[PDB]
């Protein structure tokens, strides 16, 4: 009996539990309050129950535990975590905590934590003796993270283009630069699909900032890995809170020699949120951004590394350009040289409805020698040499035609070399 | 026992000492906190405790002492320095201080020092009577700093091309102008390796600004001399204080008739940090960059000189062009006339995968007569007059082809003269 199976289910669970456990009148309140009523009525019986979620530390040890199913909304379903347990188990923000849960006594309205039985999907005894993320020596991307799905579909074409445009490996740090209406959302969809198909072992999690609710629903009903999204309805303070929770959870996961992958849409929106939430430092840059305001997002982008001890943390965040706002241009300029992978999308190609609309010459990755082999390295080199002269629209038309003629990337290289 | 000895040890050993010395949960916190805890527990035992590092003076004499291996980061393990011994010893910023340290008392969190045993690797009385860096009369470069490794390595052609392109001497002010994806980082790496090998006597310092952590790790693991870097995650004040500490330490070392070399990557990033940290003065140049904001970086570049009394301070700083940000080239034409050694890297040569990509015709050195003998100067003049007409890509291809079949620079000279 866990809190998860009573959260993800729809209002059919509401009506069934109302007609079964005999609650007075449900279906007039948020899912958090419905779940609160169900848990209160079930704890009234006294049957043993347990919970799970992601730990969070407030400014004074007021331990909270959020749920990733509900996108980390602060509601009644949040689980109390006492400071005594915090200093006993030595837990910090982002820890995945599951264990026995306690009904509340008089004076409080939150379930506390009876005892833990799983910390970060591991024994709590072994979780304490773990090296910090900040104390891990970074390296370059070693293991190639292939995106070719290999099922011979038609959407996979764009994924194939990725394997020809910019190589992506474990621990990379990439920026997808694109104007509005250029295919960012479907590119992220295809990247998530490729990660779920080719690399089921690595943890995939997608963060969405101030996106429309319809796009959130489309994202959450297609990707395999869990997805967290905050709409533009919520204030930017919640955007910052969600981003901090995501990055802390990723750090905690990668501290256990796990491969974490984060997809962010968008870094510009997160920078906006940080700019409009952080108090002014008295120094305002061009475009209306505070000098310290951009310090926080960079750290979020700075966590991408390839730990030598074990595991890696890859971050692929998209950036908005040509949006008519000078502040977006300032943010992109400040983030221009940070990433080690660049994927440039052009509205000129997308105008002709040729997808994916990737500026092949501008897009690329740095020191990909450590990622891929050498023979296909010069294959891609000669491909780049022959595709360099003609224009980007013609380049993409030629690329998609030649890729559709063949079946796989290796077959594509075979045909290109033999012809 | 040495605080620096503990700092140089890796992260993991915190367990090996801690479980043997009284710490029950020492894994989960920042490394400097472990160092603080262990050295507190050692001061509890009562044996004498050493300390050393670079001194720093605050706005009110509230002095601190940082460590090089920590990249001059303000941490709990920093050594407190009261104004009393500052006044008695006449210490100044950038001093190298070594000696006793004292456990903190009630109301103090930092470790004070009992008495100094060595100042600037010299007796405090002898180091007391030293001349200011400002009062030292500058000169031109006299002692040639040859970069030819001479072991016939697989990369020694880069150093050979460097010697044939721009002669480097002691106390020389150099600029490396290159676009992105040109080869700045490991060109500087080869420079540092050649300095460490050919000239072990001179102190080698490498300074990196807002660089990616992987590059920082590679630089730390590759160069023999000490290297300091601040990643782009850190704010601009961190960059400014790191650069100030480095330049002050270099001045203090060269005040003792020592040769110091500073490799800077990059002066553009340091100028950007100074621009975004210095308060506005009401005069904004093109590209949204203040006027006096460039005052501080030039002083950092203005310390390269050759001294009558002794010692030398060479600075090789790289600059970025063809980036797309207006302030970058604004800084570039705000730095052309300052440097007396120029090294241009071109994108076109790098696009042909021919390395090192050095624009030989545009690069050069002024007042090279005082650095080199007349015979090899005439040989280089003959090479320059036979290399001028053909283009940079062809020039570098020809230079690499001719240098590959020879062994040393002199052999190349006779090979071209006999033809
Ligand atoms: N691989 C693709 N195959 C077919 N159509 C595509 C593909 N990628 C993008 N499109 C089309 O491109 C258009 C825009 O797609 P989106 O990814 O939703 O745009 P966007 O990048 O999210 O930019 P916004 O959200 O409108 S600011 C739609 O008409 C899609 O059908
Ligand atoms: N002498 C050389 N031999 C072989 N490859 C080289 C040589 N010099 C440069 N390269 C290659 O050219 C690229 C230069 O890499 P970097 O030195 O890291 O570039 P950079 O000058 O640091 O500019 P950034 O930091 O990437 S914007 C890499 O792909 C290297 O493999
Ligand atoms: Mg979209
Ligand atoms: Mg570099």
Q: What kind of sheet is the major sheet of chain A? A: 9 strands, mixed
| Strand proportion of chain A | 15-25%
Count of helical segments of chain A? 15
End-to-end span of chain A in angstroms?
A: 63 Å
List the helices and strands and how they pair.
The structure is cut from a larger assembly and holds two copies of chain A (419 residues).
Chain A: H1 11-21, H2 31-45, E1 50-56, E2 63-66, E3 79-81, H3 83-89, E4 96-102, E5 112-119, H4 124-128, E6 138-139, H5 156-165, E7 173-178, H6 184-198, E8 203-211, H7 213-220, E9 227-231, H8 236-254, E10 259-265, H9 267-277, H10 295-302, E11 305-307, E12 312-320, H11 326-334, E13 341-344, H12 347-351, E14 364-365, H13 375-387, H14 392-405, H15 409-418
Parallel strand pairs in A: 7-12, 7-13, 8-9, 8-10, 10-12
Antiparallel strand pairs in A: 1-2, 1-4, 2-3, 4-5, 6-11, 11-12, 13-14
The complex binds phosphothiophosphoric acid-adenylate ester (2 copies) and magnesium ion (2 copies).
PDB class: gene regulation
Keywords: Transcription termination, Phage inhibitor, gene regulation
Entry title: Rho P167L-ATPgS-Psu complex II locked
């Amino acid at each position: 009996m866990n809190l998860t199976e009573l959260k993800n289910t729809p209002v059919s669970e509401l009506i069934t539990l109302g007609e079964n456990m005999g609650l007075e009148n449900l279906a007039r309140m948020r899912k958090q309050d419905i779940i609160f009523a169900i848990l209160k009525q079930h704890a009234k019986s006294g049957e043993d129950i347990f919970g799970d979620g992601v730990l969070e530390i407030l400014q004074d040890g007021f331990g909270f535990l959020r749920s990733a199913d509900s996108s980390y909304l602060a509601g009644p379903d949040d689980i109390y975590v006492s400071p005594s347990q915090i200093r006993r188990f030595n837990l910090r923000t982002g820890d995945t905590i599951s264990g026995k849960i306690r009904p509340p006594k008089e004076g409080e309205r939150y379930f506390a934590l009876l005892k833990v039985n799983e910390v970060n999907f591991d024994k709590p005894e072994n979780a304490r003796n773990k090296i910090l993320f900040e104390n891990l020596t970074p390296l370059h991307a070693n293991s190639r993270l292939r995106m070719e799905r290999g099922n011979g579909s038609t959407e996979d074409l764009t994924a194939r283009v990725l394997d020809l445009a910019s190589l992506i490996g474990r621990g990379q740090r990439g920026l997808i630069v694109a104007p509005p209406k250029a295919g960012k959302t479907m590119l992220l969809q295809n990247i998530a699909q490729s990660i779920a198909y080719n690399h089921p072992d690595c943890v995939l999690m997608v963060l969405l900032i101030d996106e429309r609710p319809e796009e959130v629903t489309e994202m959450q009903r297609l990707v395999k890995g869990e997805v967290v999204a905050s709409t533009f309805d919520e204030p930017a303070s919640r955007h910052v809170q969600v981003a901090e929770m995501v990055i802390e959870k990723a750090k905690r996961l990668v501290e256990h020699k796990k491969d974490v992958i984060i997809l962010l849409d968008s870094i510009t929106r997160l920078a906006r949120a940080y700019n409009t939430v952080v108090p002014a430092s008295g120094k305002v840059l061009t475009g209306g951004v505070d000098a310290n305001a951009l310090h926080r997002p960079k750290r979020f982008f700075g966590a991408a590394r390839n730990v030598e001890e074990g595991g890696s943390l890859t971050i692929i965040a998209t950036a908005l350009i040509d949006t008519g706002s000078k502040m977006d241009e300032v943010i992109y300029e400040e983030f221009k040289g940070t990433g080690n992978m660049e994927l440039h999308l052009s509205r000129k190609i997308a105008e002709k409805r040729v997808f994916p609309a990737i500026d092949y010459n501008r897009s690329g990755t740095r020191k990909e020698e450590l990622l891929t082999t050498q023979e296909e390295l010069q294959k891609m080199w000669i491909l780049r040499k022959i595709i360099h002269p003609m224009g980007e629209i013609d380049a993409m038309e030629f690329l998609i035609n030649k890729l559709a003629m063949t079946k796989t990337n290796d077959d594509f290289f075979e045909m290109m070399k033999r012809s």
